[PDB]
Amino acid sequence: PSSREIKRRIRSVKNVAQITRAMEMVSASKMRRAQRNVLATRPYADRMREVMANLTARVVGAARRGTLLEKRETVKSVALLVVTPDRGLCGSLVANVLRRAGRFITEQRAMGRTVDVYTFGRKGRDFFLRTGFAPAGEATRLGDAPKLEAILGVAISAINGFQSGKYDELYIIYSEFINTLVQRPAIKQLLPVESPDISTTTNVDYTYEPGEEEVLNSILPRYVETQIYQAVLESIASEHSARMVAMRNATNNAKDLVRDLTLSFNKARQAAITKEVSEIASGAA
Amino acid sequence: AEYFRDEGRDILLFIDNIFRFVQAGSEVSSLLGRMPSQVGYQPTLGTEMGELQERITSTKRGSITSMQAVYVPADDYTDPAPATVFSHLDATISLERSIAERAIFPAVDPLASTSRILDPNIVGEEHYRVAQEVKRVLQRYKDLKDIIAILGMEELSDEDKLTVQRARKIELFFSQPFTVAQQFTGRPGKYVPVKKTVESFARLLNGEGDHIPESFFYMQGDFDDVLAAYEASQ
C-alpha cells in the first residue's frame, strides 16, 4: 500500500514469471526428448511381448512353470515398485502416485500380507522414510535418459527376493503418460499372467536348445526388467510433461498476480498523488 | 442509558455506525471553518471520540455492556475515524471484504480481531490455547498465500500442506448461519455455546475431522453437526 513495496512485489513476481517460463520451455524440451526415447525403446518390448505370449502358450505344466511362472498359492508377501520424480514442481503427479501407493499398502495390509516397496527417485524414498516404513531397495539420482543398468540394481534384488520366497507377488506403480495434459498413475503386475499383448495369436512351436527351464529362467528376468525400464521411461516422460504444464499454469498465475499488483500499485499511486496535492493545497490555504 | 446505569441496571448499548457520528462531526466542522486535518477530517476528532466514548463505560454503580459498529470508508482501516475508534475498545472485531465475497458471511477476520479478556486465567486455559493455535495456523496460511497462488499447494512442505488444509477448514468453519440470515442462507440459525466452540476447534486442530472434505465445514454449528453432515453424505 506504500506504492514502493508494491513495486518491489511486482518486480519479484515478474522475475518469478520469467524463471517459470524458462522452466516451462526447458521442461518441454526434456519432455520431447523423453518421448523420443520412449519411442526408441518401444520396439524392444514390442518384440519381447509376443515372445512371452508364445512361451506362455507352450509352457502349461505347473511343475515345469517354475521361476517367475510359479503362481504360488497362499499369498503372504508382496513387493511393489514405485517410481517418482527426482525433484519437485512436477504438479500433482507425485501426490497421485504416492496416494496410489498408500492405498495399495492399506489394501494389502487389509489382506494380512506384508508389503515391501522399492523407490525410484528421491521423492518416493523420502516419503516412505517419513511414513516410517523404510524401503528395502532404493535407486535415486536416476538420469533423465537412464540406461537399463540403472534399474538392474532394483530389478535383480526384487527377482532374487521373489525366487527365494521372500516376496510372492511383484507389482509396479508408475505415472502413466495418457496425454500431455493428464498423467495418471497405473498399476501393473510383474508376474507374467498370460502376456495379453496379442494373447496367443501366433502359434509356432520353438526348439529350446538351452532347454525349457534354462530358457524361461533367462528370459523372464529380462522381460520383467524391460517392463520396469518401460515403466520408468514412461514415468520420466510423464514427469517432464507434468512439470511443463505446472510451469505453464504457474506463469499464468504469476502474470495474473502481476496484473492485480499493478492495479493495486496504480491505486496507491493515485491515492498518494491525491494526498500530496490535497496537503499542499491545504497548506496554501 | 446513563440514568439506567446509575441505578445499577445492566444496560446493553447497541450504538450503530459510530463512524457516522465522526463523519457528521467532520461535515459540521468543515462548515464551522476549522482547518481540516488528515483526509478532510475535523481537527477535534480525537477529543470528540473521547467525549463520546468515555461516557460508554461500566461504572461500579452499574455496567454498560456496550457493542458498537464502525464503518471504515472505502476499505481503508487506516482512516482517522476507525483509527481513533480502535483504542477505545476491549474486544475488536474486523470484518474483511475478501472473506465476505467468499460467502463466509460472518466474515470476521480472526487475525485482525482480538479482545482483552483473551487471557488464560479469564477465559480459560483451554480456550486461550485453542484461540492462539487457530490464529497461528491461520497466520501461516496468510504467509503462504502467495506461494499457494503461484506455485500451488503441491510444492510446499507436507507439514505446511497439512497446516494450510487445516487453516482452510478453520476459516470455513468460522462460517455460521444466523437466525436473522435465514432468508439468505436456507439453513436455520445456530446458537453455538462457547464451550462447544472451544471443543470443536480443539478437535479440528487435533486431527479429528481431517478426513472430512473442507466443503462440509461451511455453515455448520459445533463439530458434531459437521460429523453428522459427513456421515449423512457417507
UniProtKB/Swiss-Prot annotation, chain A:
Name of a matching Pfam family: ATP-synt
Gene Ontology MF terms in the entry: ATP binding; proton-transporting ATP synthase activity, rotational mechanism
Keywords on record: ATP synthesis, Cell membrane, CF(1), Hydrogen ion transport, Ion transport, Membrane, Transport
Main localization category: membrane
Subcellular location: Cell membrane
Alphabetized InterPro entries for the sequence: ATP_synth_F1_ATPase_gsu, ATP_synth_F1_gsu, ATP_synth_F1_gsu_CS
GO biological process, one term: proton motive force-driven plasma membrane ATP synthesis
Function of the protein: Produces ATP from ADP in the presence of a proton gradient across the membrane. The gamma chain is believed to be important in regulating ATPase activity and the flow of protons through the CF(0) complex.
Oligomeric and partner information: F-type ATPases have 2 components, CF(1) - the catalytic core - and CF(0) - the membrane proton channel. CF(1) has five subunits: alpha(3), beta(3), gamma(1), delta(1), epsilon(1). CF(0) has three main subunits: a, b and c.
Protein name in the entry: ATP synthase gamma chain
Organism whose genome encodes this protein: Chloroflexus aurantiacus (strain ATCC 29366 / DSM 635 / J-10-fl)
Swiss-Prot record, chain B:
Record's subcellular location: Cell membrane
Gene behind this protein: atpD
Family: Belongs to the ATPase alpha/beta chains family.
Record protein name field: ATP synthase subunit beta
Described purpose of this protein according to its UniProt entry: Produces ATP from ADP in the presence of a proton gradient across the membrane. The catalytic sites are hosted primarily by the beta subunits.
Subunit structure comment from the entry: F-type ATPases have 2 components, CF(1) - the catalytic core - and CF(0) - the membrane proton channel. CF(1) has five subunits: alpha(3), beta(3), gamma(1), delta(1), epsilon(1). CF(0) has four main subunits: a(1), b(1), b'(1) and c(9-12).
Protein origin, superkingdom: Bacteria
Transmembrane segments: none
